[PDB]
Amino acid sequence: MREIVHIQGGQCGNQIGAKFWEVVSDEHGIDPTGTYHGDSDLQLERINVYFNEATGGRYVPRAILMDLEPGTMDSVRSGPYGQIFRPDNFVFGQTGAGNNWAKGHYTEGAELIDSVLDVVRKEAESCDCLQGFQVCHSLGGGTGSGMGTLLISKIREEYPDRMMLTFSVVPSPKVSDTVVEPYNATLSVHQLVENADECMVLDNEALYDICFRTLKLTTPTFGDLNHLISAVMSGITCCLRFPGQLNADLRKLAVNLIPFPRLHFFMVGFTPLTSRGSQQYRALTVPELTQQMWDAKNMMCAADPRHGRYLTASALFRGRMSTKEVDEQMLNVQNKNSSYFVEWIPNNVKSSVCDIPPKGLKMSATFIGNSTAIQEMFKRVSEQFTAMFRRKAFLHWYTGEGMDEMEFTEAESNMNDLVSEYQQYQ
Amino acid sequence: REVISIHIGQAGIQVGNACWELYCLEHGIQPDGQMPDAFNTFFSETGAGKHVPRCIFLDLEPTVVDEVRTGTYRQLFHPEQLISGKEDAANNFARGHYTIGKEIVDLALDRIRKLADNCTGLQGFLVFNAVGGGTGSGLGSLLLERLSVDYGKKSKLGFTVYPSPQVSTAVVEPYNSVLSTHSLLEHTDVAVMLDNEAIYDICRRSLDIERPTYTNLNRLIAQVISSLTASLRFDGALNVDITEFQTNLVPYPRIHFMLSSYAPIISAEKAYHEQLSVAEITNAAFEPASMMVKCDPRHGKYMACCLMYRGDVVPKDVNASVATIKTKRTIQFVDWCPTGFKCGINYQPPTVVPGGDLAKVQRAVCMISNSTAIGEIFSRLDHKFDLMYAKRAFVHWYVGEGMEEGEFSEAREDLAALEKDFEEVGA
Amino acid sequence: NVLNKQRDDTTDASRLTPGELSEEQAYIQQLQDEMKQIDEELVEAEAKNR
Amino acid sequence: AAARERYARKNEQNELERAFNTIDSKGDKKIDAEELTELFLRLGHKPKRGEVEDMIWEVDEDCDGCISLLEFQTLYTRCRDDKTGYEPRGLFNVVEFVMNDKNNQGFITLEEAMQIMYLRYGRAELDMQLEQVFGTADLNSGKILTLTEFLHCLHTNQVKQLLNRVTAKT
Ligand SMILES: Nc1nc2c(ncn2[C@@H]2O[C@H](COP(=O)(O)OP(=O)(O)OP(=O)(O)O)[C@@H](O)[C@H]2O)c(=O)[nH]1
Ligand SMILES: Nc1nc2c(ncn2[C@@H]2O[C@H](COP(=O)(O)OP(=O)(O)O)[C@@H](O)[C@H]2O)c(=O)[nH]1
């Protein structure tokens, strides 16, 4: 029916998506060789959203891997569920950006994104009625930020009346891998404010604290973080793949959650998330799900909403549940903590239910809250960017490649008006 | 992706003898050149099962080259690669740059061209030289001049040996270092300093070797290079390339001088009684008791740092460890840079070579940082170079070769100008 | 002998110097004109559809 | 604003009848696509490959093919009161030009009379349809009126409200 193509950029995007296709294929019962082995008819009836039957029970994922280094692509086909992707979908450069956003947006982008667009165009016309596009990338890298950024701009110029998601991890001062993170973040977000339909703000700090306290893991490699992110992404699209009492497509959530067109950066959470010592001691009820859902520490972004107010919030529930519990729980969590919600919008929480849980659990949830606390992140990177730019450090790879001085001044100005308009609407 | 490594001078090709030794012992190749795909960055395959390194040894004196022609690796190196002159520059920068250099560097160039042509995705070059001599200084700078005009956009990793402050073997080396830096400044993209007294102190204290020769020095240098190319050779949880250091570590096109260090340099006995984890090696990479250049970053301020991690290392603790470093106050970063780190983790541990004095360690860290303590060393060189230049000692040899008094004064004021440049960025 | 060797190298160096490709630059220029023509052609057609 | 329009119609009706007969070249009541090219040649403008077919297509809506005087008044009135109709105006312009012509090369200051009748508008709005200035006159022809009117209608049609909307500030 409605179809979503998948686009993974850079190293972070590629590895996030690899675990994503593994988890999804397990939900629909496709083995790593790409054949159907499920039992229920509910699994076979909605695999056209993410796959195409090739020949004789061969279901291939509708995904496009794109980056600038061969190591990532080889690491995809090596691991399991690596043999399911069509090899033509590996659009692929060779030289590399080197964490230089200009090289990802002006130097190397000019020779790859045309090739990327051919594969993307083929995957859009391969399906009938597009629901939207799904892009997983970072904001601190070069080949994920710049490459994915220019791709997003060109795509919105081609298919403008279609939805678009960008799952993006953002950098933070405590988890600081690259040195030019602020230059990449502020310019990348400057493009996201005018191109993306809605963006989902992620960051690595929150992922580390989820695996520290909630999951109580000892050695949380990147496989577990990608495992966490994949559960959230599968949750946002369960409504398209399984029937339920209250369905909510991507368009339904965006039109309902975004009160003003430029304010489309979200904070995400997921429930339930429990450690192996406490997976036995818990119950599975809607209120138990709700408090662990709205918890401050359980946000999958390191921006505490309790420093500000909620504008809108959304809940996507999965499993056999009673809709009265759904509605009364949203009403109670809004009445006790009444100051944390915006005032000139009553009933700031939209909720929906789907009748199919993730495999291995009786009942789960997914939270999408559009709060006003997100301006902290924009200031936290803006001051670092201004601190660097007022002495032109690290600028010659930017100005020597094609940027001028006015682009950084444009970035600050757009940065400053967005944090100012967040401040007004709060 | 490929990178070729060129070696100039007595110290240069001796360093190569340890590097290619380490390489074949890591990729399981016998010294004759046959296995009993990741080797593609350094070795090209004949197609008959023989692997040949991407390297050219060249110098002006045939002594150090011809023991290599008859060691164990007689059959590993292609004969044309091992270039050799007929007579030495003899610790005379001008003699290596104008008299004898002008005949030998053109042969090296039309050789290095077909090494690059055999390559496909050339990442860059990386050069090895000691500035105290005449070959590594003179034709080294001449070779870098002609390399910049040929390629330009390709990285040129200069792993140079600067003369030690107090421990020195030659007497005209202050002249050679100043004139060489004058051109190493505007040609090398990323130039790493490797002193000799610092490596001497590491082998004395850490390796507890009280009688070290040049063999152990070259051994640990190869270890740092191996730790730096593992990200290019092998896959890790978080990798970087050689084009990453060009952007992430040098804020201005003339400030490219990095302090290197490595950890843990530990003997065979401490490892048995001691514990290895990520936090302590993240600490040990920063203390000045493990640096490779006699300077103190405690006197300077950091611009940006880089961290190679090898072995069984997860990414959660490298972040936690670098966080603990920033919250400490013994070392401080420049005001303009809020974030000053570039981290990287790779899966393969460092292999060991039999006969070396490096233990088999479970994990290791290779740190490459940039600071302003490097400004003190350059100033320290200027005092004793200017000390003798005014009275015109030893000038008659260089000017007799065909130079004049002009290039001393103009090279002197250029590096003097660099002193002022370092002081103004630190403020 | 050395003068003749040097002279040949200069002649080789002069041959190698990149030279402007007239037969190809004009093609690029003509391609952009047709591209811009089609953009304006496209906007009138979209107006017609509304 | 009605008085300007009613008075204008009272006088232009007689001009219109002769304008019609003059456009016809066969001495009949029907205006063929053939005649339109002849008229443009008189104006000194050239049609494109398919312009005439569109011109004949859009105007006629009670029968198919050639046009008739009855269709012509229907067109005239609908277009004249069309203002917020977003309606076609391909063949209205050529006839209004011919009627507003009495010099047999075009008209100069009479654009303002055309403009005021449509709306009082503004001097800046006049600087939109063309570049005429109050003191200076110009030479004009068929070429420079139809093209500018056609382009203006395309320019207004494009603008619509998607994310171009602007709400009062908080
Ligand atoms: N670190 C290190 N330095 C060395 C080694 N061998 C020589 N050197 C240094 O090289 C410097 C002199 O240059 P050499 O490489 O020996 O000689 P050269 O550079 O070829 O110059 P010429 O003697 O004129 O040929 C000395 O100051 C030493 O410090 C070595 O094995 N390890
Ligand atoms: N969740 C997750 N994040 C990653 C992974 N690898 C890298 N990152 C993040 O990516 C950022 C660096 O971006 P990078 O991987 O260089 O992006 P790219 O070069 O554009 O592909 C860091 O802040 C990391 O937190 C991974 O396997 N999982």
Side-chain angles (χ1 to χ4, degrees):
Chain A
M1 192 64 277
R2 307 173 292 243
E3 302 103 311
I4 315 164
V5 307
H6 199 100
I7 290 170
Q8 320 187 8
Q11 176 183 37
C12 179
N14 275 314
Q15 294 177 14
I16 282 182
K19 271 292 297 196
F20 167 70
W21 283 111
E22 192 176 347
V23 64
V24 161
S25 301
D26 295 327
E27 265 192 11
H28 277 287
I30 294 92
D31 291 331
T33 176
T35 78
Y36 178 63
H37 279 252
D39 53 74
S40 163
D41 302 68
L42 278 152
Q43 318 180 358
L44 183 63
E45 62 155 50
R46 291 305 169 196
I47 48 179
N48 49 0
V49 64
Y50 285 168
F51 301 92
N52 315 311
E53 190 179 296
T55 314
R58 195 54 186 239
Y59 300 114
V60 292
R62 190 183 290 113
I64 294 95
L65 300 176
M66 61 95 88
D67 49 308
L68 296 178
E69 300 314 340
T72 45
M73 311 280 256
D74 303 351
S75 308
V76 189
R77 279 173 278 211
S78 307
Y81 291 96
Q83 288 281 126
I84 59 183
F85 302 125
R86 172 184 293 159
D88 312 77
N89 297 339
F90 285 176
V91 68
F92 179 75
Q94 72 197 262
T95 62
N99 292 341
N100 197 239
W101 195 88
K103 287 186 64 143
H105 204 271
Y106 290 101
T107 300
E108 276 70 21
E111 309 80 21
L112 201 80
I113 292 185
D114 46 359
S115 198
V116 187
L117 280 174
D118 293 331
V119 178
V120 169
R121 203 161 295 111
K122 183 195 68 133
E123 283 294 7
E125 60 84 20
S126 179
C127 73
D128 60 359
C129 187
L130 274 172
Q131 168 80 11
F133 305 123
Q134 198 179 308
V135 175
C136 301
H137 65 84
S138 290
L139 288 192
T143 181
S145 286
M147 201 39 80
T149 288
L150 198 149
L151 183 52
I152 285 301
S153 190
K154 287 184 82 68
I155 287 171
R156 282 296 294 265
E157 290 320 312
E158 271 200 4
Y159 297 154
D161 54 356
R162 305 261 60 101
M163 282 306 168
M164 180 151 263
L165 304 187
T166 78
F167 301 101
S168 43
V169 297
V170 305
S172 166
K174 310 173 62 188
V175 287
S176 297
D177 296 332
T178 311
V179 177
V180 292
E181 282 169 352
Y183 278 77
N184 298 351
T186 182
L187 269 72
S188 280
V189 172
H190 165 257
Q191 205 81 22
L192 282 191
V193 177
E194 291 279 327
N195 290 334
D197 263 346
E198 67 262 33
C199 172
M200 185 179 287
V201 190
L202 276 294
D203 50 4
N204 308 121
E205 285 175 359
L207 294 177
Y208 290 173
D209 273 7
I210 286 167
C211 302
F212 285 166
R213 285 169 192 191
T214 57
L215 269 298
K216 298 188 180 181
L217 269 61
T218 300
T219 67
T221 186
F222 279 131
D224 312 340
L225 313 186
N226 303 300
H227 186 101
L228 182 78
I229 292 169
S230 46
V232 176
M233 295 161 58
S234 43
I236 309 307
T237 178
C238 191
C239 275
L240 316 173
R241 304 183 282 107
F242 292 123
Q245 293 148 333
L246 280 77
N247 60 7
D249 292 331
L250 267 53
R251 199 175 303 273
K252 183 159 282 196
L253 286 176
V255 176
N256 291 318
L257 194 84
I258 302 174
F260 294 92
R262 279 153 68 250
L263 287 63
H264 53 274
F265 296 129
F266 309 141
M267 293 180 183
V268 292
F270 172 76
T271 289
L273 287 180
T274 56
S275 44
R276 294 321 171 61
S278 184
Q279 182 61 255
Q280 202 272 297
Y281 295 152
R282 78 175 188 185
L284 275 299
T285 79
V286 177
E288 289 184 18
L289 173 149
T290 304
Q291 297 93 26
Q292 199 264 331
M293 174 177 213
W294 291 90
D295 204 331
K297 54 155 291 163
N298 206 24
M299 293 322 290
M300 185 179 288
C301 201
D304 217 358
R306 300 182 294 175
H307 293 41
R309 63 184 72 193
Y310 277 97
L311 279 79
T312 56
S314 285
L316 315 180
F317 296 140
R318 300 177 59 199
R320 194 71 70 72
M321 44 196 309
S322 177
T323 76
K324 192 188 96 65
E325 281 177 3
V326 173
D327 277 357
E328 64 90 19
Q329 287 303 306
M330 300 299 110
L331 180 64
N332 295 115
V333 166
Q334 188 166 161
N335 282 326
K336 293 172 199 168
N337 294 98
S338 292
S339 177
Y340 290 132
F341 286 96
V342 76
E343 64 182 0
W344 47 277
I345 299 90
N347 290 318
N348 311 271
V349 177
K350 163 169 178 37
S351 43
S352 44
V353 190
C354 165
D355 199 3
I356 298 300
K359 304 262 199 93
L361 282 153
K362 188 262 281 188
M363 189 203 64
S364 159
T366 294
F367 172 74
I368 304 100
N370 183 17
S371 88
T372 196
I374 74 172
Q375 57 157 26
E376 61 162 300
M377 291 323 182
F378 285 124
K379 287 177 63 65
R380 189 152 70 143
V381 62
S382 175
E383 291 316 278
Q384 295 180 349
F385 180 73
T386 55
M388 278 194 198
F389 195 70
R390 186 262 182 275
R391 186 32 180 81
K392 313 294 175 291
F394 296 100
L395 206 78
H396 56 295
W397 298 291
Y398 291 145
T399 288
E401 279 72 347
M403 276 163 285
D404 311 330
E405 167 173 310
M406 294 317 81
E407 282 86 357
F408 299 94
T409 72
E410 291 180 353
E412 62 86 23
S413 58
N414 289 104
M415 203 75 182
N416 290 320
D417 60 52
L418 276 296
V419 308
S420 181
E421 71 186 33
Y422 265 104
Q423 189 281 358
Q424 65 202 69
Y425 284 120
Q426 70 174 16
Chain B
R1 72 199 179 272
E2 293 91 300
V3 63
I4 79 175
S5 44
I6 190 173
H7 303 68
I8 49 163
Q10 159 74 255
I13 69 177
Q14 276 200 68
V15 160
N17 290 320
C19 280
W20 290 108
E21 157 185 36
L22 188 66
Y23 287 0
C24 316
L25 278 294
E26 179 156 355
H27 292 285
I29 302 186
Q30 294 67 58
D32 52 18
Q34 304 177 28
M35 265 198 188
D37 188 52
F39 60 86
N40 207 12
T41 148
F42 282 123
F43 310 100
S44 39
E45 176 80 342
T46 66
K50 190 107 161 178
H51 309 248
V52 30
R54 294 185 171 88
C55 62
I56 43 177
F57 293 164
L58 68 164
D59 67 355
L60 288 186
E61 65 181 4
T63 62
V64 58
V65 187
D66 307 330
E67 86 274 13
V68 168
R69 278 158 173 159
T70 49
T72 177
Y73 294 97
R74 296 174 260 95
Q75 296 283 339
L76 183 81
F77 294 99
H78 169 62
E80 267 80 8
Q81 314 282 318
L82 310 183
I83 320 171
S84 170
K86 278 204 198 198
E87 53 276 60
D88 191 318
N91 291 119
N92 193 359
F93 184 83
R95 192 174 176 89
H97 199 287
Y98 303 89
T99 65
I100 319 297
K102 293 292 180 68
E103 294 82 0
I104 202 57
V105 306
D106 56 3
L107 177 64
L109 282 159
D110 189 0
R111 190 66 210 176
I112 192 167
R113 199 205 67 265
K114 72 175 47 64
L115 293 178
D117 292 330
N118 179 33
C119 295
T120 177
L122 183 60
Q123 293 286 332
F125 311 88
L126 62 94
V127 306
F128 289 86
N129 61 334
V131 307
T135 61
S137 313
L139 65 93
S141 88
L142 176 54
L143 184 82
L144 269 296
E145 298 259 345
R146 306 267 272 119
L147 274 189
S148 59
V149 174
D150 290 324
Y151 305 79
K153 60 183 178 301
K154 293 312 205 204
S155 87
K156 286 178 275 288
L157 273 290
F159 296 86
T160 66
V161 176
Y162 265 55
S164 175
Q166 67 272 16
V167 169
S168 66
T169 59
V171 72
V172 300
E173 50 187 294
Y175 282 70
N176 300 303
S177 314
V178 167
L179 296 161
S180 43
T181 313
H182 174 31
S183 45
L184 173 151
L185 187 154
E186 54 93 12
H187 290 326
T188 301
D189 312 312
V190 163
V192 168
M193 289 89 84
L194 278 296
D195 196 280
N196 286 321
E197 181 60 23
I199 317 182
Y200 278 164
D201 289 333
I202 284 182
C203 313
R204 194 252 308 275
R205 304 182 82 116
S206 74
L207 276 177
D208 272 338
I209 297 306
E210 211 50 46
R211 210 185 305 274
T213 181
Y214 281 170
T215 67
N216 313 328
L217 270 67
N218 300 54
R219 277 189 198 277
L220 61 90
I221 297 183
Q223 198 75 39
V224 168
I225 303 307
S226 187
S227 296
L228 185 138
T229 54
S231 168
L232 189 70
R233 287 212 304 305
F234 304 111
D235 70 343
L238 193 149
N239 52 3
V240 310
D241 308 350
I242 278 164
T243 310
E244 296 279 340
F245 297 167
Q246 282 167 328
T247 76
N248 301 334
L249 278 184
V250 288
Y252 296 89
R254 286 178 98 191
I255 307 183
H256 47 62
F257 294 98
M258 276 63 87
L259 302 178
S260 77
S261 76
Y262 186 70
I265 314 284
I266 62 170
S267 285
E269 188 44 14
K270 306 299 153 312
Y272 178 70
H273 291 75
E274 292 168 2
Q275 194 175 39
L276 270 298
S277 308
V278 177
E280 62 269 36
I281 58 187
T282 316
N283 299 133
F286 276 136
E287 59 166 294
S290 313
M291 295 296 172
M292 306 294 212
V293 173
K294 303 299 311 213
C295 81
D296 193 354
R298 281 188 166 119
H299 302 126
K301 308 169 91 143
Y302 283 105
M303 285 73 74
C305 176
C306 200
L307 293 180
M308 288 325 186
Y309 282 65
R310 291 195 51 172
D312 170 354
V313 168
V314 305
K316 61 151 172 201
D317 44 12
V318 299
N319 295 34
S321 283
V322 61
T324 53
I325 291 297
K326 272 184 207 207
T327 64
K328 271 190 179 169
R329 189 191 171 310
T330 298
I331 53 180
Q332 48 176 15
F333 281 70
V334 283
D335 303 357
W336 29 276
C337 248
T339 160
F341 280 94
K342 183 61 199 72
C343 298
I345 306 89
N346 192 11
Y347 292 152
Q348 286 208 358
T351 81
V352 305
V353 292
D357 293 332
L358 60 86
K360 174 103 151 157
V361 176
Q362 189 59 265
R363 310 175 199 93
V365 175
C366 166
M367 183 278 288
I368 308 101
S369 66
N370 201 341
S371 174
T372 63
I374 68 155
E376 87 180 1
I377 202 64
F378 278 45
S379 45
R380 191 185 194 289
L381 274 171
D382 198 3
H383 309 326
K384 69 169 54 176
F385 166 81
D386 187 359
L387 180 137
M388 314 163 177
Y389 174 62
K391 274 173 31 199
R392 292 302 191 273
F394 293 100
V395 71
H396 75 275
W397 286 105
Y398 300 83
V399 182
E401 287 175 351
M403 297 303 106
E404 55 270 5
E405 274 78 348
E407 84 273 6
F408 290 107
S409 301
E410 65 82 11
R412 178 69 275 171
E413 289 292 317
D414 208 3
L415 165 73
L418 170 76
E419 288 300 328
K420 184 55 166 290
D421 188 334
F422 267 92
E423 180 268 2
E424 59 88 11
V425 162
Chain C
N1 269 338
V2 190
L3 184 135
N4 287 27
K5 183 182 176 181
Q6 292 223 320
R7 178 170 297 158
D8 190 357
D9 186 317
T10 73
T11 299
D12 289 331
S14 84
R15 270 169 167 173
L16 283 180
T17 307
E20 202 284 300
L21 283 74
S22 64
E23 78 291 332
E24 190 167 17
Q25 187 275 328
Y27 195 20
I28 295 288
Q29 214 294 339
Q30 164 180 355
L31 283 194
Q32 313 269 37
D33 292 331
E34 306 216 10
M35 183 79 153
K36 182 175 73 68
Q37 165 181 357
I38 297 304
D39 308 308
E40 207 281 343
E41 195 54 46
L42 177 137
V43 66
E44 62 81 20
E46 75 191 324
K48 262 187 168 182
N49 281 319
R50 284 302 285 110
Chain D
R4 65 179 64 88
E5 172 247 21
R6 268 107 45 96
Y7 121 87
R9 205 195 322 180
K10 281 193 284 291
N11 185 274
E12 302 192 306
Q13 56 87 30
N14 61 92
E15 291 293 42
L16 180 88
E17 299 168 54
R18 85 174 176 66
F20 198 106
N21 296 119
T22 57
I23 296 166
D24 187 74
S25 79
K26 44 179 62 58
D28 193 350
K29 67 182 290 294
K30 298 296 289 183
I31 307 186
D32 205 9
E34 211 185 30
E35 320 169 31
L36 261 61
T37 55
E38 308 299 354
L39 181 50
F40 302 160
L41 291 180
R42 304 265 325 292
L43 274 68
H45 154 74
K46 189 179 289 293
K48 299 178 59 93
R49 183 182 52 168
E51 181 181 1
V52 298
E53 294 294 328
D54 296 341
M55 196 86 98
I56 190 172
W57 183 78
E58 61 81 14
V59 291
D60 54 0
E61 299 169 80
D62 294 2
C63 64
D64 303 333
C66 189
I67 301 92
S68 190
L69 66 82
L70 196 173
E71 300 179 354
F72 176 81
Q73 70 271 18
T74 61
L75 173 75
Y76 186 34
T77 185
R78 66 191 47 177
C79 173
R80 185 274 305 272
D81 201 334
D82 187 359
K83 172 175 303 283
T84 187
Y86 277 6
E87 289 294 328
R89 302 200 170 53
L91 183 134
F92 176 82
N93 293 340
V94 63
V95 291
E96 62 81 29
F97 179 78
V98 168
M99 68 188 73
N100 290 318
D101 184 41
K102 335 280 187 297
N103 309 350
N104 309 332
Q105 54 72 38
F107 61 91
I108 303 296
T109 296
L110 297 174
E111 177 179 61
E112 286 164 65
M114 281 289 337
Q115 169 196 17
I116 302 315
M117 175 210 309
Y118 200 49
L119 240 172
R120 237 298 124 100
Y121 278 136
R123 319 195 74 95
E125 197 268 356
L126 172 102
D127 298 347
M128 187 278 288
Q129 70 274 17
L130 283 180
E131 299 96 3
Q132 185 172 141
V133 169
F134 49 81
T136 52
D138 295 323
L139 288 166
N140 192 328
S141 71
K143 190 71 62 184
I144 297 89
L145 198 56
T146 288
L147 190 152
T148 185
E149 301 284 293
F150 184 100
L151 285 195
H152 94 272
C153 173
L154 286 51
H155 295 100
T156 292
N157 290 348
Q158 296 299 144
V159 177
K160 298 176 274 303
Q161 300 297 67
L162 286 72
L163 309 160
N164 303 8
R165 176 188 160 83
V166 184
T167 60
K169 304 322 151 293
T170 50

